[PDB]
Design a protein around this ligand. Structure first.
Ligand SMILES: Nc1ncnc2c1ncn2[C@@H]1O[C@H](COP(=O)(O)OP(=O)(O)OP(O)(O)=S)[C@@H](O)[C@H]1O
Ligand SMILES: Nc1ncnc2c1ncn2[C@@H]1O[C@H](COP(=O)(O)OP(=O)(O)OP(O)(O)=S)[C@@H](O)[C@H]1O
Ligand SMILES: [Mg+2]
Ligand SMILES: [Mg+2]
Lengths: 327, 254, 319, 129, 258, 258
């Protein structure tokens, strides 16, 4: 049953009308398929944008419910070498369908992990067998693909999910589940997503589990922040104010009590302070240079461990010394 | 439930030898009229299809069909305990997580029992067999194996061409070309060596030698092989069993 | 839907050497060679999508006439091209007897010659030397340095260059005339700008824009194909003030879904190929970019690292 | 005297590139010389051997010396190269593009018009290893 | 000195086949009552112990014991010249640097002679055999080989469990589990196929399948195999020879111990 | 033209088995009195030379000699279709680009036909056979194979020494040394097992074991093998056919020369 799959897998789009966020590419692909001219596609974009769902729904709309048989889907989980290409992909492209009549579809998902020799062998397979089969390459990084292979396909960039589409999907999930969500809670949820539907679905399931109730109540900002462990804008701005204006010992005490009262992480506070200070209209860019350099150094040091108190004091001192040049 | 006892474990071992290597996953289904099994290779050019009727067993009981999928390699790994003469019983409940293979010698003596883990495969049996094929022919399977083994050395493609009263296998590659031409004939001195051919339309198809090589394994199950060809569908190579058959459907080249 | 139509790159693929709008010198050279005969061993190098494979295909077709099927041996990177293949099949084809006109020769086309192993390339030397009177070799590669010098010593070297704006514009105008498409000057200009001397990519973008919107206009071309990525990165690095570069990185690159790895790597390429600033400042910017590249490869790839890289580059440019 | 066919199809012996990295031509633009040398280092694919060559040669090269700091700046690059080379065995070789830049720092820092003679070189490191 | 002539080179070749692969160094010692040999694998979980009495030879002379160590691989490399039917004579002086293997055909015709270099091994023969084992059983060795070959595919550990009138071999791993259950029985139609079992105490031990696989080789020396198990010591698998025996002592897995 | 029909494809298959592995290219030439073939290995220490007279065939027609060179590997790849009992006909025109192998069963039934691509080889047949050799000996080829297979294990060099009424094969390497000594003898109970020796001068030559191993393959063509040795030239090992022979000329090691 579908009630056992996680929310990321349960709510996977099955038709092209359930893929939100991407409109300019979805309409163009629908027109390509209706008019017949479907070229070799290259879906490039960040994780969680809906490239795999888009191509799966496309193959479903093209071949019907028997998609799992008329399409050759290869990914990084499967062995994709040069010999694998030579045998499997060439035998698939050269032959025809065993279930119906029509062009074939080869979905090379996550093809950014393929060997250079494999791409060099495939770039002539795409150019030779082009009247009976098509190629779809999904990628997160366009630098791992050879320029020859990159030039044979039409590139579609999957933009991050905007506010309207992610709110539409959230409303769809809140309709499918016996769940209510606060408006400010929804805004905070959209803020900690960066256009990643996977994160939204995961944390929505997690905060529904956090409710502890038969779901007769609502999900507020407190639930989201306590479940995702993300700092609140209130505590963020309080720490920033105490760092910018208050005394050194008082700033240290404030940072300690804020990061220990809710168990917040220093890296999340660093990213939040970076995001907040990005809107600050500042004087001569030397302060911004020092701030960015020191904050990136502290983040790279945190990414390897160390003393949290020493790193917090380093953040405080870096912000203070950077702002001391603004006078 | 599944409860099928083979008189000789050898029959099942040879049947599985046929799926061996060319496919990884097999989907079995037992029911009131017997057992069927289907396996498709990754490139989807070969389908291996089995049918064993109730009469092929020494004991068969089924009051509730069971479908079960498994890794072919795991199965063959376990399929060398039959002593060939051992008795083999396939056993499974109505909602199995495993398949039990039970080998026993006549006397109570030695009992080898296995519990193979199953894989979940979306049930989707194909029914691609045709009513009529362009041409139909049968010949000794050992002869077909030799024909395939000859030509294979020359190319990765072996062409089968059929015209009135003529069957011609051809391979042409780097070192040169080869051909084997056979003609229909009835041998009364023993008709299991005859070569029959019924042609409704001349055919000319090419197959990947690597696949024909997988298919010839069926020789171990039957003296003769039936080959049905069509320009409209995958070719059918069939090896008859006592109450049953092992079929290989192979898609022609371009 | 039941079947698709052939793309314009394959449908309008040139079949005669006159239809090629590539480098005029080498094109007329190959045309005169096909007219007179005596085709020598050749190696055609260049960049993807400029008319290298089509050129050698047209040359072989025009030179062999109807004997193309039995006189031309095509081997691509999709086929096995190791030492065993060169030893058996190529040698059997070169030793094969074939009655040809007194001005033609058997042609062995080897696409993607830069991918052949060293053993096969070494074995091909005497293979092409002992049968140089009845078999000729034409290599098509992107990097001539990947082919050993002994092989290059026995053949001509044809280096294909980028296609200027005029040639791609003329070819696109011919395609539009042959297809009856509604277009405009700014749309074709945007297409050629996003092509970057890539004729195949230009025709592909044109066909995609036609099948997606019908009218080839700059707005449609820009909405269906993003601007040349390297150009926005160059404009970001060449910014004079830190806030302008930060806003460019935020809006154009980060808010549109460009990964940090692509941004930093595109950034490295732009710098390496930069010519506006001096050598020392370019090396310092490359050093800072490469330190950011290091941090990113370790999984610390975020917007803060790119912001710090830009800040360090500006500090270097800050005298 | 046979070298015409070599100029026709063979690259630049990594030794010849090392001696070219310490030479400045007074009659050509420094930027054009830098891009020509970058292309020669990239085409050779053996940036490590070129750098080891530069490391063995730089103490014997004539370079206007103020306090031998030039060597201190180059120890930091060389250390950057060693970190990059260690990371090539841990990570997919995207970092290989930056390996050609380290040899070019020798051209910027130690390239002089005085260096007209070819310094021959050896492999003390293989013997030391 | 060493002077031992085997009627058929084949017997010695099969004996060495038993030490083969599972051990690298073997320490032989000839004496007045015959020849013994011991070899222990590197992990020290398996001991291979041989005893060949004077009567197993066509000619044996010993007036002065000689101990000699050698590389098993070197020995087997040379042990395929026996034609099986050839006569084999092992020869060595009292302070040898080598061991001479002399193969001769009945007629004077062909004489293959080898001089194998010896290794110096500290003489330290083990005497780990027990007076009484918890349980003792014998069964056809080909049957034991099949049992081991079956289960081996399933796991790197094969458990042997003994209860009154029941012997059960079990393996359980990734693909699933398997078991072979045998019962004691006297076959008068030919008692070499019987399965005997004497149990003083139920036993349940686990062994590394890789080792049991090495041990089954003894089938080529005897029709039956004797298995003696104890919770206090290494298990003993024994293959009798005419005047002699080849024994394999295998330490049970502690939880992870071959 | 070439038109040679072998009664049994098996004879040709065994002949080619002899060239197999040790040589890559073979140069055949058919003519009025039969077919000859020569192949030399890359190091030029071994020459394989064949002669099949007209009478060895069931049908042979030649009004115009034809010389043809080919890759041995390609030929053997095709040489397993003979069913051994199949009939084999070699066919080629006077200026061939290919060689046709035609296998047919008695009945019209199955016809396997191959068209093998030829290689151009500069015709240069060697005639290195001597009038008289220092010593000549023949013995059963299976015996010679065993002798070679024994010694091969010990060294990469096998020495053949001949003195009056004595033939001695010797190998000496790392693990030790070995020798096989045989004496001339006439067995009337069946003379195909006799060992003849005619010595005009004692000889002592060393050969590379890898080559002698290639040569022993001829056992499948003849019951006996003739060995002719000289200190002045390559040794000759010969396997007689009905109307014909397969010869292997092997250069002695100088000290290091196969
Ligand atoms: N545009 C979208 N509309 C609706 N749900 C979406 C959308 N994009 C992603 N999702 C959800 O996120 C899940 C994962 O989507 P995927 O297509 O697998 O992500 P992706 O774009 O392929 O990125 P990868 O797989 O990490 S490279 C889907 O099953 C949906 O539940
Ligand atoms: N000069 C040209 N004139 C017309 N069309 C061209 C020209 N060059 C390329 N094209 C088009 O581009 C398609 C592919 O060209 P190719 O020759 O395959 O590219 P390439 O130069 O060989 O680079 P590769 O194959 O990626 S190494 C052709 O089928 C044409 O449609
Ligand atoms: Mg995906
Ligand atoms: Mg090309």
């Amino acid at each position: 049953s579908k009630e056992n799959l996680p929310w990321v897998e349960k709510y996977r789009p099955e038709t092209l009308d359930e893929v939100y966020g991407q409109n300019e590419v979805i309409t163009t692909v629908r027109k390509f398929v209706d008019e017949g001219k479907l070229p070799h596609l290259l879906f490039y974009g960040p994780p969680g944008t809906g490239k795999t769902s888009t191509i799966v729904a496309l193959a479903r709309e093209i071949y019907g419910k028997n998609y799992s048989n008329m399409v050759l889907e290869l990914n990084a989980s499967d062995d994709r070498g040069i010999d694998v290409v030579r045998n499997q992909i060439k035998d698939f492209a050269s032959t025809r369908q065993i279930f119906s009549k029509g062009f074939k579809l080869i979905i090379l998902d996550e093809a950014d992990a393929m060997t250079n020799a494999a791409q060099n062998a495939l770039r002539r397979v795409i150019e030779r067998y082009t009247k009976n089969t098509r190629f779809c390459v999904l990628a997160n990084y366009a630098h791992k693909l050879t320029p020859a292979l990159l030039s044979r396909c039409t590139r579609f960039r999957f933009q991050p999910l905007p506010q309207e589409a992610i709110e539409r999907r959230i409303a769809n999930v809140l309709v499918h589940e016996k769940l209510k969500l606060s408006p400010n809670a929804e805004k905070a949820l959209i803020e900690l997503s960066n256009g990643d539907m996977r994160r939204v679905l995961n944390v929505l399931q997690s905060c529904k589990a956090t409710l502890d109730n038969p779901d007769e109540d609502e999900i507020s900002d407190d639930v989201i922040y306590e479940c995702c462990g993300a700092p609140r804008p209130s505590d963020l701005k309080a720490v920033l104010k105490s760092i910018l204006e208050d005394d050194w010992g008082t700033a240290h005490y404030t940072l300690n009590k804020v990061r220990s009262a809710k168990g917040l992480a220093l890296i999340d506070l660093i990213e939040g302070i970076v995001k907040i200070l990005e809107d600050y209209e500042l004087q001569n860019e030397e302060t911004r240079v020092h701030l960015l350099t020191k904050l990136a150094d502290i983040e790279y040091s945190i990414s390897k461990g160390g003393n949290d108190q020493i790193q917090g004091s380093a953040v405080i001192g870096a912000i203070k010394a950077s702002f001391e040049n603004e006078t | 439930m599944l409860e099928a006892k083979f008189e000789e474990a050898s029959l099942f071992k040879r049947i599985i030898d046929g799926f061996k290597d060319c496919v990884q996953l097999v989907n079995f289904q037992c029911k009131e009229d017997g057992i069927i099994a289907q396996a498709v290779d990754d490139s989807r050019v070969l389908l291996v299809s089995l049918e064993i009727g109730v009469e092929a067993f020494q004991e068969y009981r089924c009051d509730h069909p069971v479908t079960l999928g498994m890794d072919l390699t795991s199965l063959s790994k376990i399929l060398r305990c039959g002593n060939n003469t051992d008795t083999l019983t396939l056993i499974a409940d109505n909602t199995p997580d495993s398949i039990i293979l039970l080998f026993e010698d006549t006397k109570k003596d030695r009992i080898a029992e296995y519990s193979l883990k199953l894989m979940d495969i979306d049930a989707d049996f194909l029914k691609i067999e045709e009513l009529q094929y362009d041409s139909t022919l049968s010949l000794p399977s050992s002869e077909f194996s030799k024909i395939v083994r000859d030509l294979s050395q020359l190319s990765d493609s072996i062409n089968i061409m059929i015209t009135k009263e003529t069957i011609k296998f051809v391979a042409d590659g780097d070192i040169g070309s080869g051909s084997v031409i056979i003609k229909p004939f009835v041998d009364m001195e023993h008709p299991e060596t005859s070569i029959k051919l019924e042609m409704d339309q001349p055919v000319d198809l090419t197959f990947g030698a690597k696949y024909l090589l997988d298919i010839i394994k069926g020789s171990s199950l039957s003296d003769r092989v039936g080959i049905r060809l069509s320009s409209e569908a995958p070719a059918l190579f069939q090896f008859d069993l006592k109450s049953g058959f092992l079929q290989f459907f192979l898609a022609p080249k371009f | 839907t039941l079947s698709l139509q052939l793309p314009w790159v394959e449908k309008y693929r040139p079949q005669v050497l006159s239809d090629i709008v590539g480098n005029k010198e080498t094109i007329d050279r190959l045309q005169q060679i096909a007219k007179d005969g005596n085709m020598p061993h050749m190696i055609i190098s260049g960049m993807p999508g400029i008319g290298k494979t089509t050129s050698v295909h047209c040359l072989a077709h025009e030179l062999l006439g109807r004997s193309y099927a039995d006189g031309v041996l095509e081997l691509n990177a999709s086929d096995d091209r190791g030492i065993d293949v060169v030893r058996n099949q190529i040698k059997h084809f070169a030793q094969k007897k074939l009655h040809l006109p007194p001005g033609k020769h058997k042609i062995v086309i080897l696409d993607e010659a830069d991918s052949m192993t060293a053993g096969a390339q070494q074995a091909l030397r005497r293979t092409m030397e002992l049968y140089s009177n009845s078999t000729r070799f034409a290599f098509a590669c992107n990097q001539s340095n990947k082919i050993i010098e002994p092989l290059q010593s026995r053949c001509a070297i044809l280096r294909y260059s980028k296609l200027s704006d005029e040639d791609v514009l003329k070819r696109l105008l011919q395609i539009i005339k042959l297809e009856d498409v509604k277009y405009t000057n700014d749309g074709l200009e945007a297409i050629i700008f996003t092509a970057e001397g890539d004729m195949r990519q230009a025709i592909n973008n044109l066909q995609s824009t036609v099948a997606g919107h019908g009218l080839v206009n700059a707005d449609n071309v820009f909405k269906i194909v993003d601007s040349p990525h390297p150009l926005i990165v160059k404009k970001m690095l060449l910014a004079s003030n830190l806030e302008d570069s930060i806003q460019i990185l935020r809006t154009d690159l980060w808010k549109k879904g460009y990964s940090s790895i692509d941004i930093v790597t595109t950034s490295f390429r732009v710098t390496k190929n930069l010519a506006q600033v001096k050598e020392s400042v370019r090396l310092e910017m490359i050093k800072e970019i490469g330190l950011t590249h290091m941090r990113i490869l370790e999984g610390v790839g975020t917007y803060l690292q790119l912001a710090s890289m830009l800040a360090k580059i500006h500090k270097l440019n800050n005298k | 005297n046979t070298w015409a066919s070599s100029n026709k199809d063979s690259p630049i012996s990594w030794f010849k590139i090392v001696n070219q990295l310490f030479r400045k031509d007074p009659h050509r633009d420094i930027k054009e010389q830098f891009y020509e040398l970058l292309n020669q280092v990239e085409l050779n694919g053996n940036s490590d051997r070129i750098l080891q060559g530069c490391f063995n040669i730089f103490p014997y090269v004539k370079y206007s010396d103020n306090g031998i700091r030039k060597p201190a700046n180059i120890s930091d690059w060389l250390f950057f190269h060693d970190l990059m080379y260690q990371s090539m065995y841990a990570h997919n070789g995207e970092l290989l593009r930056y390996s050609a830049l380290v040899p070019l720092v020798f051209f910027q820092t130690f390239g002089d018009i005085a260096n007209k003679d070819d310094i021959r070189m050896k492999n003390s490191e293989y013997e030391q290893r």
